[PDB]
Scaffold this active site. Sequence first.
Site, PDB file in Angstrom:
ATOM      1  N   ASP A 153       0.808  -1.236   0.000  1.00 36.69           N
ATOM      2  CA  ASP A 153       0.000   0.000   0.000  1.00 36.69           C
ATOM      3  C   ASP A 153       0.840   1.285   0.000  1.00 36.69           C
ATOM      4  O   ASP A 153       0.619   2.145  -0.847  1.00 36.69           O
ATOM      5  CB  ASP A 153      -1.042   0.003   1.142  1.00 36.69           C
ATOM      6  N   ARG A 157       1.403   5.965   7.784  1.00 36.69           N
ATOM      7  CA  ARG A 157       1.364   4.954   8.848  1.00 36.69           C
ATOM      8  C   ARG A 157       2.490   3.919   8.717  1.00 36.69           C
ATOM      9  O   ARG A 157       3.117   3.557   9.715  1.00 36.69           O
ATOM     10  CB  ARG A 157      -0.001   4.250   8.862  1.00 36.69           C
ATOM     11  N   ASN A 158       2.744   3.465   7.490  1.00 34.78           N
ATOM     12  CA  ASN A 158       3.755   2.428   7.224  1.00 34.78           C
ATOM     13  C   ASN A 158       5.215   2.898   7.285  1.00 34.78           C
ATOM     14  O   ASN A 158       6.111   2.063   7.437  1.00 34.78           O
ATOM     15  CB  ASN A 158       3.492   1.758   5.870  1.00 34.78           C
ATOM     16  N   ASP A 171       6.896  -2.843   6.928  1.00 33.98           N
ATOM     17  CA  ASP A 171       5.903  -3.738   6.291  1.00 33.98           C
ATOM     18  C   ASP A 171       6.067  -3.982   4.766  1.00 33.98           C
ATOM     19  O   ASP A 171       5.183  -4.568   4.135  1.00 33.98           O
ATOM     20  CB  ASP A 171       4.460  -3.294   6.620  1.00 33.98           C
TER      21      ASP A 171
HETATM   22  C1  38O Z   1       0.826   5.138  23.363  1.00 32.98           C
HETATM   23  N1  38O Z   1       1.570   5.467  22.139  1.00 32.98           N
HETATM   24  C2  38O Z   1       1.466   4.406  21.123  1.00 32.98           C
HETATM   25  C3  38O Z   1       2.104   4.934  19.830  1.00 32.98           C
HETATM   26  N2  38O Z   1       3.541   5.204  20.100  1.00 32.98           N
HETATM   27  C4  38O Z   1       4.621   4.601  19.380  1.00 32.98           C
HETATM   28  C5  38O Z   1       5.921   5.163  19.352  1.00 32.98           C
HETATM   29  C6  38O Z   1       6.955   4.582  18.652  1.00 32.98           C
HETATM   30  C7  38O Z   1       6.749   3.405  17.919  1.00 32.98           C
HETATM   31  N3  38O Z   1       7.529   2.612  17.136  1.00 32.98           N
HETATM   32  C8  38O Z   1       6.818   1.592  16.663  1.00 32.98           C
HETATM   33  C9  38O Z   1       7.329   0.519  15.750  1.00 32.98           C
HETATM   34  C10 38O Z   1       6.491  -0.297  14.930  1.00 32.98           C
HETATM   35  N4  38O Z   1       5.114  -0.179  14.886  1.00 32.98           N
HETATM   36  C11 38O Z   1       7.124  -1.322  14.056  1.00 32.98           C
HETATM   37  C12 38O Z   1       6.372  -2.182  13.218  1.00 32.98           C
HETATM   38  F1  38O Z   1       5.024  -2.104  13.182  1.00 32.98           F
HETATM   39  C13 38O Z   1       7.009  -3.118  12.418  1.00 32.98           C
HETATM   40  C14 38O Z   1       8.397  -3.226  12.426  1.00 32.98           C
HETATM   41  C15 38O Z   1       9.159  -2.399  13.235  1.00 32.98           C
HETATM   42  C16 38O Z   1       8.536  -1.447  14.050  1.00 32.98           C
HETATM   43  N5  38O Z   1       9.296  -0.630  14.862  1.00 32.98           N
HETATM   44  C17 38O Z   1       8.738   0.294  15.667  1.00 32.98           C
HETATM   45  O1  38O Z   1       9.497   0.958  16.340  1.00 32.98           O
HETATM   46  N6  38O Z   1       5.537   1.713  17.152  1.00 32.98           N
HETATM   47  C18 38O Z   1       5.470   2.839  17.934  1.00 32.98           C
HETATM   48  C19 38O Z   1       4.431   3.418  18.650  1.00 32.98           C
HETATM   49  C20 38O Z   1       3.723   6.212  21.178  1.00 32.98           C
HETATM   50  C21 38O Z   1       2.977   5.769  22.446  1.00 32.98           C
END
Ligand code: 38O
Length: 277
Positions: A153, A157-158, A171
Amino acid sequence: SAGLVSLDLPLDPLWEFPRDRLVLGKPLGEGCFGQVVRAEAFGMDPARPDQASTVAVKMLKDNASDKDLADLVSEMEVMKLIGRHKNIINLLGVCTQEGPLYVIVECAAKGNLREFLRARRPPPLSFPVLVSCAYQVARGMQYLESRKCIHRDLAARNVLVTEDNVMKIADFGLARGLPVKWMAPEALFDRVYTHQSDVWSFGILLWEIFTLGGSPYPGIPVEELFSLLREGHRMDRPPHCPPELYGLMRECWHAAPSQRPTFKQLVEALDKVLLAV
Ligand SMILES: CN1CCN(c2ccc3[nH]c(-c4c(N)c5c(F)cccc5[nH]c4=O)nc3c2)CC1
């Protein structure tokens, strides 16, 4: 090597990591069938085994199906072949044998690009930083294009953000599996994904950046959008955006995939703008 789900997964010495060294933490990303969690991996850099480093850990709970594991294994094996790049969520390690599967990938401190931009709003965020963000994803996408990956996509967000503001795409390695506004016409209707279908999505991603994490196609029910796209009507030039830089968005949103610009051109175009500032 492209292996499906098993009772015990095979041992791979190039990527295996000690699970006793890895220490999990609080949940970063809520997910329905699988999830991503924070973790303080001790001795991730094997040159300095004493010193530790913070990392993300993709995994799944006791509910995900046999197929759901095969997706996560497929996501892992793709990340091995693609290798390292500055603007990508790279693989660091894996924990397979004698326990649950944990795929370790590098952490992103400042969250997704949509939430990053929306937080830093004027009630910070200068113009060159926005162009620097758009330039980094273009470089990151160009590398994944050259390795024949093809992103699904592509959106704000990604794409994820580091402590020192490095745009790293996530992703990319996930197999096929809501994002109507981001999809190209041929991707919506006929469902033929190419390199040039991501070019369309990059056009939508440029819109998100220069609207400070705005929602694209504001105030429509995702139905008239289809009729709108195939009547020579696209999104407008947003508040505070140059015409030449808006011209790159219009280039991306051409109906003919051949008429859309390659990622090599979009990097070189943004390079001239980034070199100016
Ligand atoms: C409560 N609030 C939730 C959202 N907040 C947050 C902050 C930093 C963040 N990093 C990632 C993250 C991924 N989602 C990720 C993935 F989906 C796949 C592969 C590697 C990834 N590395 C990440 O570092 N999520 C976060 C959320 C802030 C606090």
